[PDB]
């Protein structure tokens, strides 16, 4: 992972569970508890994993629900730092453009690998979206979808169609249905 997002995860976790919990968690992996992560710094993925794990044991909160809450909260942050992505759009446009964003974000650092998020209409009021990654950040993905729905103030139902590994890649396909009719 690259530092920019990792740092974002760390701030959010503090915002949610307090500094004590975060710092000791940060200490448990051998980081300085006040570490300053640089945008293009290479942060080991497993190190993040254990930080979240440690937070889970310190709050008694299931680690997958922590990841979902981090996701929910990240949309707000993203809207503040990249408002050009949110302005003049309805939820459906945002979600469908997300794949493009990531493909054109792989430029941020040359080593960045954010997942595919290919979306496609499957009805007048529904789209499929498929998360595809070498990682398995299923709840982070689902959290971000829910947070997008809250931000745009458009209700959705999210139905999970497929989950699991398929040739080297972890995948999660959901069917996203809009209450109000979105397409013609």
Please list every residue from 118 through 157 that binds ligand MNH, using CB under 6 A: 133, 135, 137, 140-141, 144-145, 148
Question: In whole angstroms, what separates CA 181 from the centre of its chain?
Answer: 26
CB of 4 to ligand MNH, least distance (A): 6
Q: Which residues contact 114 (CB under 8 A, 6 or more apart)?
A: 102, 105, 106, 133
Q: Considering only residues 31, 52, 78, 169, which one is a binding residue for ligand MNH as defined by CB under 6 A?
A: 78
CB of 174 to ligand MNH, least distance (A): 9
138 among annotated binding-site residues = no
116 among annotated binding-site residues = no
- 93 scored as a contact of ligand MNH (CB under 6 A): no
Between CA 136 and CA 171 the distance in angstroms is 8
Count of CB atoms situated within 10 Å of the CB of 150: 14
Q: Are 141 and 131 contacting, i.e. CB atoms less than 8 angstroms apart?
A: yes
135 among annotated binding-site residues = yes
Count of CB atoms situated within 10 Å of the CB of 61: 14
The smaller minimum CB distance to ligand MNH, of residues 53 and 108, is found at 108
- 73 scored as a contact of ligand MNH (CB under 6 A): no
Between CA 49 and CA 152 the distance in angstroms is 30
Between CA 62 and CA 104 the distance in angstroms is 33
Q: Are 40 and 11 contacting, i.e. CB atoms less than 8 angstroms apart?
A: no
CB of 171 to ligand MNH, least distance (A): 11
52 among annotated binding-site residues = no
Count of CB atoms situated within 10 Å of the CB of 158: 13
Please list every residue from 6 through 25 that binds ligand MNH, using CB under 6 A: none
The smaller minimum CB distance to ligand MNH, of residues 103 and 105, is found at 105
Longest dimension (CA), the chain: 54
Query: Which residues line the annotated binding site?
Result: 2, 78, 102, 113, 131, 133, 135
**Residues near ligand MNH, by CB under 6 A:** 1-2, 5, 78, 82, 85, 98, 101-102, 105, 108, 112-115, 117, 133, 135, 137, 140-141, 144-145, 148
Query: Which residues line the annotated binding site for heme b?
Result: 2, 78, 102, 113, 131, 133, 135
């Amino acid at each position: 992972m690259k530092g920019t997002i990792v740092g974002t995860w760390i701030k959010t976790l503090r915002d949610l569970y307090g500094n004590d919990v975060v710092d000791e968690s940060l200490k448990s992996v051998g980081w300085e508890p006040d570490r300053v992560i640089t945008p293009l710094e290479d942060i080991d993925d497993d190190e993040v994993r254990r930080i979240f794990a440690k937070v889970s044991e310190k709050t008694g909160k299931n680690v997958n629900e922590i990841w979902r809450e981090v996701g929910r909260q990240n949309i707000k942050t993203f809207s503040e730092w990249f408002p050009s992505y949110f302005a003049g759009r309805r939820l459906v446009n945002f979600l469908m453009m997300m794949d493009e964003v990531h493909l054109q974000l792989t430029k941020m650092i040359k080593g960045a690998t954010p997942p595919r998020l290919i979306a496609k209409p499957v009805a007048k009021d529904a789209i499929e979206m498929e998360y595809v990654s070498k990682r398995k950040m299923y709840d982070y993905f689902l959290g971000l979808i829910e947070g997008s729905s809250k931000f745009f103030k458009e209700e959705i139902s999210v139905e999970e169609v497929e989950r699991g590994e398929k040739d080297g890649f972890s995948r999660l396909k959901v069917r996203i249905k809009f209450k109000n009719p979105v397409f013609e």
